Amino acid sequence: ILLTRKSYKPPKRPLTEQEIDELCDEWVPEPLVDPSATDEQSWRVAKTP
Amino acid sequence: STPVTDHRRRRAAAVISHVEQETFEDENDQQMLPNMNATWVDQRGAWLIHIVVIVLLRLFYSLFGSTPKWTWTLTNMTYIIGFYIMFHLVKGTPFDFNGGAYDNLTMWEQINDETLYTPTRKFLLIVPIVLFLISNQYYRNDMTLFLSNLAVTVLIGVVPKLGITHRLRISIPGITGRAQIS
Numbered sequence: 233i234l235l236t237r238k239s240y241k242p243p244k245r246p247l248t249e250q251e252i253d254e255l256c257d258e259w260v261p262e263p264l265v266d267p268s269a270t271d272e273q274s275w276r277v278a279k280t281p
Numbered sequence: 282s283t284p285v286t287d288h289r290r291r292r293a294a295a296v297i298s299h300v301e302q303e304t305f306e307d308e309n310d311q312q313m314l315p316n317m318n319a320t321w322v323d324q325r326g327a328w329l330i331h332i333v334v335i336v337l338l339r340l341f342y343s344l345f346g347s348t349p350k351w352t353w354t355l356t357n358m359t360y361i362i363g364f365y366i367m368f369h370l371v372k373g374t375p376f377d378f379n380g381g382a383y384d385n386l387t388m389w390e391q392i393n394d395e396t397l398y399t400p401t402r403k404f405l406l407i408v409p410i411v412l413f414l415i416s417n418q419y420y421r422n423d424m425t426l427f428l429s430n431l432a433v434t435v436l437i438g439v440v441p442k443l444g445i446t447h448r449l450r451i452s453i454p455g456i457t458g459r460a461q462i463s
């Protein structure tokens with residue numbers, strides 16, 4: 233039984249709530265839509281009959 | 282009065298406890314350098330020396346004249362006690378590593394940077410049991426010697442090396458004293 237094991241490594245510890253909180257507070261999402269090129273493309277709206 | 286840098290060692294506040302895992306700086310300090318204390322184990326001739334010391338002990342005790350059962354039980358107990366003293370008693374390193382970085386691990390836990398059930402750990406597990414099987418054929422007719430030898434083996438040479446006793450410290454009052462957890 234001993235000779236037929238698989239040589240793993242002791243697993244790491246589970247994150248405590250404070251680590252979760254700081255990692256959540258670090259994250260930055262993007263805006264829903266991209267307003268970077270809303271101006272140089274918007275002639276189509278201005279030229280619709 | 283609060284410290285800017287918290288590098289303070291705690292002690293066990295219970296009876297049965299585990300040494301706390303290390304933080305980021307501690308892991309970096311441990312992994313910055315190959316451990317000079319537990320690297321000789323994997324080199325050329327270590328397994329052979331573990332074999333040879335037993336033969337030398339056997340020849341010595343046989344030189345003391347006594348009957349086969351006594352010589353073999355003496356060999357078994359001497360090897361087991363010596364191995365426990367060398368590999369499981371003292372914790373730390375005999376030389377300055379870093380900020381210290383291993384001040385609460387024994388040499389057995391330091392082997393192969395705390396990777397369990399490696400070939401060397403398997404060999405060092407196998408050796409005590411085969412040594413007991415060889416010696417079993419000589420003092421088999423005495424209940425007291427058989428029982429004592431089996432107890433010493435299974436309780437000193439197989440239990441500390443098990444994968445569940447890793448980082449396990451037992452702290453009683455009046456003998457062991459408060460262990461170190463952080």
Ligand SMILES: CCCCCCCCCCCCC/C=C/[C@@H](O)[C@H](CO)NC(=O)CCCCCCCCCCCCCCCCCCCCCCC
Pocket residue numbers: 318321330331334338359360363364366367368371373374375388
């Ligand atoms: C009052 C009577 C007391 C009993 C006699 C005195 C015994 C107490 C002295 C021994 C204390 C040892 C403390 C810890 C020693 C090591 O761990 C240190 C610190 O980690 N490591 C190092 O220095 C790094 C390793 C350096 C190389 C050591 C290995 C050299 C070759 C040994 C190979 C393994 C030998 C077989 C396993 C041990 C069996 C010991 C049998 C003992 C009886 C036969 C020899 C006399």
